[PDB]
Structures are given as C-alpha cells and as structure tokens.
Structure 1
C-alpha cells in the first residue's frame, strides 16, 4: 500500500495527501522523500508540496525535524546582491501569506537599491534592471509554498493567457471585481482559497508600468517559468 503511494511521488499531490494522513509510516515516507531531493537545484512542485504538507500537520516532532534538517527551507536562498530571503521563506513556511507579501514588497525595494528603499516604491526601469537570480528565488518560494497557486510567474502566464490585457487580468486574479478595485489590505484573500495568481500583490496606485516590466523580465524564460 504505502510503497505504491511512494512510487506515485514521481496526481502527486493526492499521494502526498494520503501519505500524510497515514501516521508515522506515511510521514516517514514523506520525510525520506525530502532527504532524497533537498536541496532543490530546480523548483519541483512535488517537493514543495511534501514539505508544506508536513509543516501543515503542525506536529512538534515533524516541525522540529524539518527545521533541523532544512533550516533555510528546501530551496537555495540565492541573491545576486547578498539579500537575506530567510524571513520570506519562514513566512511562507508558516503559510502567513500576508506577512510574506509585505516582506516581498520590502525585498523588491531593497533589491532595487537605496533610492527605492528610501521612497518605498519602484520605478519600472529599476524593475527592468533587477537581477534574474533574485526574482527566481523569490518566485520559487511563493510557488513552492502555495502548490503553484501564487507567484509572479503565475500572474505572468495568466496575463499571457489574457492577450496581455491587464483589464482582463485583474478579475482573474481577484484584484478587481467588476468596476471596483479590491481594497488593501482587508479586501484581499490571504490563504490558498484565493484565486490563482492572487499573490504577491502589485499596487496599482502608480499604474501598470512596474507590473508589465516585471512580467516582461527575462528571468521567466531564462529559468523556464
């Protein structure tokens, strides 16, 4: 039974869900799966789902073991500018998407430099000059810890599937409901019941220029997003 479920890891989510509900046996299988695939070299959703499913059990022994074996998560926290992405990983690992959103916004300004860090918002030109590596790390964390539901890559593909029309994009990802913009922060859905691409948020107070620059950034094609 359990070995059959083990082979389903390589549809994958159903097996993962089943294993986690099967006591020490199934969880032992999940834990062993991480040991054979962590650290990731490329983002693999199954690995993210295994880690997050185990985290979601909220059992002390599992959580402690995960924190001990994988203190920085399952994905290398790489930065072309030496930025620390652990607080982001920790927020996503705790499924605190609201905090993760806040951190991501702060990290993008930090990535852009002292100018954006001071004014606390971005210019589209700064977005164009973002290093691909940092965007990859940030997006991977969102993607891996949300069953592929969240991430700029997710928003970008929906945008492409909308003929690059932002007015069609907003209702799909829940940032607009007809003629009314979703109100920050209470109007947004900070959990996995949110629509595909709902997070991270990109404030439209200053237009779509930042968003478009981000979606058109070479990182997505370069890293196979």
Structure 2
C-alpha cells in the first residue's frame, strides 16, 4: 500500500513530508521510524528530519509523545567535560535558532574553560584544544535540526569549496554582502530561509583565527563530517 511504500522511501525528505501531511496513519509511521532509530549512534539526517517535521506540526499529543519518548532528543548529549547540552537541543527542537546561537556561543566559552567564560570570547589556541566529542555533539544538533543547512561542518565544507578563502566564504553564508558586514543581531536570518551555513555565527570582530582553527580541528575528519 501507499503508506508502506513511503515507509520504504525513508529522497528521504519527500516521503517524510508526504507522511506528515497524511494524518494519524502517516504520523504513526514516522513515530515508528523514530522508535526504531533513536537514540542515534551516527548522525542520520532522515532521523533528524522525521523528528523535526513532527515537532513542526505543533500538535499537543505528538509534541507530548516526543518529549516523553525522547526527552533529550534523538542524539546522545555527550561532553568530554560533562557540559549540559539539553538547553541547546531544546532551542533547536523549537526551531528557535537565535536562542540556539546564543547558547552555542556560551557553551563554546564554557568548553574552553574559566578564562574564556570570564572574558566571554575565545582564543584560537583554546579552539585548537577543544575536545572533539563536544564539537561533534554541538554540530550534530545543529545539523540534525536544520535539514543539514546549519552547522560548523557545513561552513567548513563551503570554506573548502571556496579554496579556503574567507573573503569568498562570507557572501556564500550571508555574513557579508559586498563590502557590508551583516550587522548583529538584526541583520541575520534566524530561520531556515537562511543560506546554507548561515548558523552558528562566529563573530569576526577579533579576526578569522578562531573560525580557521575551528574549521581545521580534527573532529570533522574524525567523525566523518
């Protein structure tokens, strides 16, 4: 039957979208898919898309069931430093990308330690020493909850495709428009209409050293990003 065919299609995005618009039957199939695939080991975009598509329906019973079954979301919230990533997950699950961006900024300082937490900005050497595990968790959350549109991994791949020229990267990801830097916070696009790689933001006020160290970090290759 048609719904079963759609289940097999889990192109993944098209089936998921169709199933979600097909009432209780379609939504049941999506819920069963999560039950069979969560918690994720590796990030799988289809699973992120099923969860987020269901969240986006904004229906009490679905949302309540998701919170009950998956109170911490679909991806293990692991940290080499014991950091709490649930508020980041919650902001992303609500598609509140502006809050998610603020939390990510705060969490990176927390990850770097007392000094960064106090000054509220990073040195490139702190970024180089970040544990891979935390960067993987943070990136996975952004990626899984944005249909792969957001994440440092996404920016890194665009940077690689720009010959590592940051001046070519900024317009691609919407951080500069010609000679004009995008102005924080109102100039940015806090939704999925934003260009690929738009979030999370890396303030350029202190130069590109932090961003470059982040994109060169071993985590991306290590975890297959």
Fold match by TM threshold 0.5: yes
Q: Which residue of 1 aligns with 2:32?
A: 32
In the aligned structure 2, how far is the partner of 1:54 from the partner of 1:70? 12
- In the alignment of these two chains, the number of paired residues is 224
Unaligned ranges ≥5, structure 2? none
In the aligned structure 2, how far is the partner of 1:167 from the partner of 1:128? 22
In the aligned structure 2, how far is the partner of 1:40 from the partner of 1:12? 17
Deviation of 1:32 after TM superposition, in Å, equals 0.1
In the aligned structure 2, how far is the partner of 1:181 from the partner of 1:6? 45
In the aligned structure 1, how far is the partner of 2:6 from the partner of 2:111? 42
In the aligned structure 2, how far is the partner of 1:23 from the partner of 1:193? 26
Q: Which residue of 2 aligns with 1:180?
A: 180
Q: Which residue of 2 aligns with 1:58?
A: 58
Deviation of 1:175 after TM superposition, in Å, equals 0.0
In the aligned structure 2, how far is the partner of 1:164 from the partner of 1:8? 36
Per-residue CA deviation, residues 78-106 of structure 1 (Å, 9 max, x unaligned), is: 00000000000000000000000000000
In the aligned structure 2, how far is the partner of 1:220 from the partner of 1:122? 20
In the aligned structure 2, how far is the partner of 1:58 from the partner of 1:105? 28
Aligned partner of residue 14 in structure 2, secondary structure: helix
Unaligned ranges ≥5, structure 1? none
Q: Which residue of 2 aligns with 1:5?
A: 6
Per-residue CA deviation, residues 143-185 of structure 1 (Å, 9 max, x unaligned), is: 0000000000000000000000000000000000000000000
Q: Which residue of 2 aligns with 1:74?
A: 74
Deviation of 1:51 after TM superposition, in Å, equals 0.1
In the aligned structure 2, how far is the partner of 1:198 from the partner of 1:88? 17
Deviation of 1:74 after TM superposition, in Å, equals 0.1
CA RMSD of aligned residues (A): 0.1
In the aligned structure 1, how far is the partner of 2:101 from the partner of 2:3? 37
**TM-score when normalising by structure 2:** 0.99
In the aligned structure 2, how far is the partner of 1:212 from the partner of 1:192? 25
In the aligned structure 2, how far is the partner of 1:141 from the partner of 1:24? 27
Aligned partner of residue 36 in structure 1, secondary structure: helix
Per-residue CA deviation, residues 104-157 of structure 1 (Å, 9 max, x unaligned), is: 000000000000000000000000000000000000000000000000000000
Aligned partner of residue 164 in structure 1, secondary structure: coil
Deviation of 1:35 after TM superposition, in Å, equals 0.2
In the aligned structure 2, how far is the partner of 1:102 from the partner of 1:171? 22
Deviation of 1:207 after TM superposition, in Å, equals 0.0
1:42 matched to 2:46 = no
Runs (4+) of structure 1 exceeding 6 A deviation are none
**TM-score when normalising by structure 1:** 0.99
